[PDB]
């Protein structure tokens, strides 16, 4: 815990190791799902917040991921009732009913309850009858006959979902597929029922017709975080900050302590960030300022501190800002912002939109204000500097590359990110847009 730069942090963190020494240790901050802890000093008073540090495709496994497990009998997209993978047991509102067709094909009385080898054994069942289905009929079985394996199971789970003469109705989708028009096929397959109803399933599908590979099915879950790094996250939100000066997040950094009240399997590295007096969340303070709205001088001064966390927030592209996680002090400044719990930012890739991410503040009345030409002016020389935007780069790496799990390609795709945000944060600055207008733009990278 050298901190040679930052003599005002280093007395703060001997302060903490001696409240250690004599006994007063770091205290979950919530007892149940403890990864975070007030740190106290030698009076016993709160100065920091510490937070520790062959896949086999097939139609088999491309229908798991479409249909999932149940085990009990539930009901659908429809809302038939249905269990295991996707099977349906009757469009009967009678569970009654469902539990009857469920006995006869299992062969005993489930009362709605199997097993996985009863689930994965109907699972088999209902694949054979798909592909029965496909080469009993006439417009079907020529298709699926001149199709590659990989589309071949696109054209199964089809079959699978809607029912053989559902697919056959694809007339002219099914005919572009068997001439191998497969731009075409996927973006007449688009415009369906069945794309409406379920578009994330049939996107997955039209991928796999329109690629012949598995593209759409093997990442699935991965997310946009790098794992296990929330620490540096945090003290990389301070970094951001300091170096524009925005001076919303309290300092935060990276240090090593050594605690009992630690889940232990020896000094625990992790994020430690300064704990602010006298603040609550935002969301307390918007519900006040309903009845007691702010005079015009506090609303500016306001509205300069929120747009100083929407550029943070921004730049960093944080996953995980509420309005519960932004805090609001409110009796040099009259009114202020701390933005804590910075943990979930630097994504090394845009979310897909089956996860947006929003920022939480960005439903705010307050979002759809103009930038004001005060941080206009302020920030813009900063960040339309190429300069700066290496060197905060260059800083970000040295900060980056402490962990054990560092990578250059995923550094380089986080930064090519946060560079991406920049030069749209620039654009809207320039085009004097509001936070609201600022999160709409798509989303760019710079390679
Ligand atoms: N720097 C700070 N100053 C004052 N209070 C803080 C600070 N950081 C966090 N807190 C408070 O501590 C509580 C939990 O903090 P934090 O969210 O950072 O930890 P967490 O365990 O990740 O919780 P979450 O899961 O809520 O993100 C919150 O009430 C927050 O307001």
Excluded at 26 to 41: A, H, L, M, N, W
């Amino acid at each position: 815990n050298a901190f040679l730069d930052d003599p005002e942090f280093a007395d703060i963190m001997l302060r903490a190791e001696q409240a250690i020494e004599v006994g007063i240790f770091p205290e979950r901050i919530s007892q149940g799902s403890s990864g975070s802890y007030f740190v106290k000093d030698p009076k016993r008073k709160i100065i920091g917040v510490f937070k520790p540090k062959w896949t086999k495709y097939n139609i088999f496994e491309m229908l798991r991921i479409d249909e999932g497990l149940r085990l009990k009998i539930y009901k659908d997209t429809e809302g038939y009732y249905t269990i295991g993978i996707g099977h349906l047991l009757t469009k009967s509102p009678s569970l009654n009913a469902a539990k009857s067709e469920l006995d006869k094909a299992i062969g005993r009385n489930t009362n709605g309850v199997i097993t996985k080898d009863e689930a994965e054994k109907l699972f088999n069942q209902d694949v054979d009858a798909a592909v029965r289905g496909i080469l009993r009929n006439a417009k079907l079985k020529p298709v699926y006959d001149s199709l590659d394996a990989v589309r071949r199971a696109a054209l199964i789970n089809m079959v699978f979902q809607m029912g053989e003469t559902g697919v056959a109705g694809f007339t002219n989708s099914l005919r572009m597929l068997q001439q191998k028009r497969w731009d075409e096929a996927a973006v007449n397959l688009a415009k369906s029922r069945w794309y409406n109803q379920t578009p994330n399933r049939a996107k997955r599908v039209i991928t796999t017709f329109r690629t012949g590979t598995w593209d759409a099915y093997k990442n699935l879950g991965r997310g946009c975080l790098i794992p296990n790094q929330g620490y540096l996250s945090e003290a990389g939100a301070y970094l951001v900050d300091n170096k524009l000066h925005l001076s919303i997040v309290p300092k935060t950094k990276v240090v090593w302590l050594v605690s009992e009240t630690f889940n232990y399997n020896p000094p625990k590295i992790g994020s430690f960030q300064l704990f602010v007096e006298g603040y609550k969340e935002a969301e307390y303070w918007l519900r006040k300022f309903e009845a007691d709205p702010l005079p015009e001088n506090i609303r500016k001064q306001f509205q300069s501190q929120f747009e100083r966390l929407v550029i943070l927030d921004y730049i960093i592209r944080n996953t995980d800002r509420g309005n519960d996680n932004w805090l609001v002090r409110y009796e040099e400044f009259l009114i202020k912002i701390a933005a804590i719990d910075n943990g979930l930012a630097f994504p090394f890739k845009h979310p897909d939109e089956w996860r947006a991410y929003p920022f939480h503040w960005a439903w705010l009345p307050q979002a759809k204000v103009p930038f004001s030409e005060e941080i206009r002016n302020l920030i813009l020389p900063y960040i339309s500097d190429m300069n700066f935007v290496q060197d905060l780069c260059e800083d970000l790496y040295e900060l980056f590359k402490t962990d054990k799990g560092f990578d250059k390609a995923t550094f380089e795709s986080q930064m090519s990110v946060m560079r991406g945000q920049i030069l749209n944060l620039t654009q809207a600055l320039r085009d004097g847009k509001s936070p609201f207008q600022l999160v709409q733009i798509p989303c760019v990278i710079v390679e």
